[PDB]
């Protein structure tokens, strides 16, 4: 007997234009491809100023290259009261700022690379580095492990 509700996972970065949209889109497609239906994906940026903007060109290009849709995905601020079942931050500043913005957070908060065998702890911000391929590789290194963790933790059907 499985839990028959949805669970919500949010990826969170600074701008909600580079890292977390990329992760959101990859995760959504991966769940579709794995025939998993009870996980809903979101993203936020702790510091998004211009709200409602599409992802950075570099993220759109990587997603387009790999035929991953991002229709309707736009920048959204991590709100004073935002909370999700699972919150997956990109770097330490994101963790710190999430906890400062919402000290009442009830969901489980992780860094993306906790689900990865890569030695790195934090996903560098390609707003500066322009290394969108590296970010893509980091998300791929974590994605199925993250899915598996949530399916088991939330007692969901696969």
């Amino acid at each position: 007997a499985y839990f028959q509700g949805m669970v919500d996972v949010a990826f969170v970065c600074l701008g909600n234009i580079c890292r977390s949209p990329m992760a959101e889109a990859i995760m959504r497609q991966r769940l579709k491809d794995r025939n998993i239906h009870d996980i809903k994906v979101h993203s936020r940026g702790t510091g998004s100023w211009n709200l409602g903007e599409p992802p950075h060109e570099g993220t759109q290009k990587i997603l387009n290259k790999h035929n991953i849709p991002f229709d309707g995905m736009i920048s959204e601020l991590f709100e004073a009261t935002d909370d999700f079942d699972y919150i997956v931050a990109m770097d330490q500043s994101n963790v710190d700022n999430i906890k400062s913005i919402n000290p009442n957070l009830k969901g489980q908060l992780f860094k993306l690379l906790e689900f990865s065998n890569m030695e790195e702890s934090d996903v560098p911000d390609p707003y500066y580095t322009n290394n969108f391929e590296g970010v893509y590789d980091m998300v791929l290194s974590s994605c199925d492990n993250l899915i598996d963790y949530i399916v088991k933790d939330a007692n969901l059907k696969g």
Binding site: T46, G47, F78, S93, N97, S100, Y127
Partner: peptide, 7 residues
């Protein structure tokens, strides 16, 4: 692109 919110 700054960490102002939350600091």
């Amino acid at each position: 692109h700054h960490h102002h919110h939350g600091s």
